[PDB]
Ligand binder design. Sequence first.
Ligand SMILES: *C[C@@](*)(O)[C@H](CCCNC(N)=[NH2+])NC(=O)[C@H](Cc1ccccc1)NC(=O)[C@@H](Cc1ccccc1)NC(C)=O
Ligand SMILES: *[C@@H]1O[C@H](CO)[C@@H](O)[C@H](O[C@H]2OC[C@@H](O)[C@H](O[C@H]3OC[C@@H](O)[C@H](O)[C@H]3O)[C@H]2O)[C@H]1O
Ligand SMILES: *[C@@H]1O[C@@H](C)[C@@H](O)[C@@H](O)[C@@H]1O
Ligand SMILES: C[N+](C)(C)C
Ligand SMILES: C[N+](C)(C)C
Ligand SMILES: C[N+](C)(C)C
Ligand SMILES: C[N+](C)(C)C
Ligand SMILES: C[N+](C)(C)C
Ligand SMILES: C[N+](C)(C)C
Ligand SMILES: C[N+](C)(C)C
Ligand SMILES: C[N+](C)(C)C
Ligand SMILES: C[N+](C)(C)C
Ligand SMILES: C[N+](C)(C)C
Ligand SMILES: [Ca+2]
Ligand SMILES: [Ca+2]
Ligand SMILES: [Ca+2]
Ligand SMILES: [Ca+2]
Ligand SMILES: [Ca+2]
Ligand SMILES: [Ca+2]
Ligand SMILES: [Ca+2]
Ligand SMILES: [Ca+2]
Ligand SMILES: [Ca+2]
Lengths: 210, 143, 249
Amino acid sequence: SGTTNTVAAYNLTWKSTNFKTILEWEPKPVNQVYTVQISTKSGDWKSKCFYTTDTECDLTDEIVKDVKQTYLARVFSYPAGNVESTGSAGEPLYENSPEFTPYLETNLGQPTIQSFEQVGTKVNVTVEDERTLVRRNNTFLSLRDVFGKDLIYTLYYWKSSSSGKKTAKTNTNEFLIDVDKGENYCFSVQAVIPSRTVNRKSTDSPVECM
Amino acid sequence: ANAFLEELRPGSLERECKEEQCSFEEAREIFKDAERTKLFWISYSDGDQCASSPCQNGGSCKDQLQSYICFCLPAFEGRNCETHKDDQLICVNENGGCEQYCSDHTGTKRSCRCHEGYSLLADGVSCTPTVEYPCGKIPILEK
Amino acid sequence: IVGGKVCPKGECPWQVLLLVNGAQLCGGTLINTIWVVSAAHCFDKIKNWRNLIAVLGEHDLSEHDGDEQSRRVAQVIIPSTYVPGTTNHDIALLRLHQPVVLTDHVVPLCLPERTFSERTLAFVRFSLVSGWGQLLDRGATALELMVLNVPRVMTQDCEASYPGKITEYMFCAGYSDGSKDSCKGDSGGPHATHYRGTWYLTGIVSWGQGCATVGHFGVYTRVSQYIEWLQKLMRSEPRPGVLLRAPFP
Ligand SMILES: *C[C@@](*)(O)[C@H](CCCNC(N)=[NH2+])NC(=O)[C@H](Cc1ccccc1)NC(=O)[C@@H](Cc1ccccc1)NC(C)=O
Ligand SMILES: *[C@@H]1O[C@H](CO)[C@@H](O)[C@H](O[C@H]2OC[C@@H](O)[C@H](O[C@H]3OC[C@@H](O)[C@H](O)[C@H]3O)[C@H]2O)[C@H]1O
Ligand SMILES: *[C@@H]1O[C@@H](C)[C@@H](O)[C@@H](O)[C@@H]1O
Ligand SMILES: C[N+](C)(C)C
Ligand SMILES: C[N+](C)(C)C
Ligand SMILES: C[N+](C)(C)C
Ligand SMILES: C[N+](C)(C)C
Ligand SMILES: C[N+](C)(C)C
Ligand SMILES: C[N+](C)(C)C
Ligand SMILES: C[N+](C)(C)C
Ligand SMILES: C[N+](C)(C)C
Ligand SMILES: C[N+](C)(C)C
Ligand SMILES: C[N+](C)(C)C
Ligand SMILES: [Ca+2]
Ligand SMILES: [Ca+2]
Ligand SMILES: [Ca+2]
Ligand SMILES: [Ca+2]
Ligand SMILES: [Ca+2]
Ligand SMILES: [Ca+2]
Ligand SMILES: [Ca+2]
Ligand SMILES: [Ca+2]
Ligand SMILES: [Ca+2]
């Protein structure tokens, strides 16, 4: 393609965790640079990542304006060092991304067990309610703030002295479980949005033990 | 970690993996079960990808599995908070902030301009009519 | 217009109605007191040039309410590259015989700078299209001016609707899901785009396969390609003749 002045991007991919949302694509800049646009399905197109050699574009600040909207992005190619040479109609070559709905598709980050507290045969296990990239006024909202009742946590726990695994689930960030006295237990959790069809679960948290 | 004679002692997660760095084998001696050990190890051995301080411009780094996330201050964006929101004041970026027309210039800030029948305000970006019926306004609604 | 609503009187104040021998022909767009932009194809079959009239301030074709201003069209200027019966270069610049009076009901639409149009107006998703043309493909024309908001697509995304048929002098807008479109008799009317409080001319109703057909879009003359051509003509010393071909570019 030594007679073409640009080639269209491809393999456009949404990388999104806790609403930090970056579009990635191919190819590495080869005699060309890129600009991205993003819109909601019925909204205006906004340009981002102007005339960049990057093969990524952070779109977090746009998608957190309404995490329940469905966003479309596209990546334009421009001849390097000659970025206004976009053909007779003013339309550079581009490719379209998949649609992306942040609320339904952003990955849940790996959780952290904040604490556990035992009194006799009962233990509280508390999960950290960590921050997302969604802003409200001047503040970052937590996972619970964003998802409300749609978010649950699951606990995987075991006694070191036994081969079985036990599970529990909570609608909050806290579990109250029964344990045998004199046994050391270990714990891991996962964040889950049961109503999702894809990316329903986070990875397991680090393991914490009595 | 292993020092002479320590391994005569029962394993201890606190002593060996929290107060010290433990190898896979040392963790294995604590948890016994292969799958339990792996579940511990995938996080314990991952490393802190924030250790390289990847978040710029006063951002805050949150470690993940084999990755991190940067929380940026309000004027910044980017994977690493490397982008300042008003660092490409060019006509293709939201019209340069101009209400009507925009021109990029070599070696000067962009300028905003207005259509015939309008004049540019002191703010350097906004336009106001200089005639009774300027183009592109709907007088029956703006009365 | 298919699937639109009545444009309340005065809310589309740059709309022009063209009549030949008192009969409805096409729309147009007022861009100042003497000049109207329309579609070249509106003139392909005219023989009675002296009876070509432009009406400003029109709304309801069944009654004269007094806000209408009627003008003989003194000259129709088309691109030298336009060929009757073919889609490309579907634009005309009309000189009225006497200026209209700007009023609450008669206002010009802004002719944007080309750069602004390509860089900014082209990325406003929706724009208004208006006219007295057919309410359904092959159906009846409208007695009250109709208006519809249509979303724009870039030509790469329209290519499959009209393979090899969308030139750089055209663009697509409308709904591939069907049911809303401009239609026959709306030609020459404005595709008008709002930006930060002001309306600009971005397209001219031109052609389509049927109207409001699934899988297709309306096709509009891409006005950004003609800004300089129109501006030069409006400054030019008038030449004789009712129909004038002027070099393009
Ligand atoms: C003249 C205008 O009033 C009118 C506008 C139609 C807008 N349609 C839409 N779906 N938004 N334009 C025409 O009728 C146009 C005239 C024409 C232009 C170029 C060459 C020949 C004729 N004709 C059509 O739109 C017409 C014919 C057509 C079909 C395919 C491709 C080009 C032209 N369409 C018909 C019949 O469906
Ligand atoms: C240490 O700092 C340097 C910059 O000086 C970063 O490049 C390092 O981060 C890089 O290497 C480790 C990867 O984990 C990381 O990429 C992951 O995390 C960030 C996500 O945006 C990305 O999708 C994911 O692959 C990479 O950026 C940093 O550790
Ligand atoms: C982490 O978060 C960012 C946004 C800044 O507020 C930092 O000061 C903080 O440590
Ligand atoms: C960790 N917590 C006990 C404060 C809830
Ligand atoms: C969407 N939410 C209200 C459940 C948080
Ligand atoms: C506090 N709770 C764990 C009982 C919900
Ligand atoms: C902090 N952590 C997500 C790595 C557990
Ligand atoms: C021409 N008109 C009398 C019908 C209004
Ligand atoms: C014919 N008239 C509408 C100009 C009065
Ligand atoms: C329409 N007009 C000829 C009366 C001006
Ligand atoms: C981003 N774009 C205006 C160059 C298309
Ligand atoms: C008019 N609109 C609802 C299509 C935006
Ligand atoms: C889905 N459809 C556009 C083919 C109707
Ligand atoms: Ca040790
Ligand atoms: Ca040891
Ligand atoms: Ca040991
Ligand atoms: Ca020690
Ligand atoms: Ca200790
Ligand atoms: Ca050992
Ligand atoms: Ca051993
Ligand atoms: Ca890590
Ligand atoms: Ca009337």
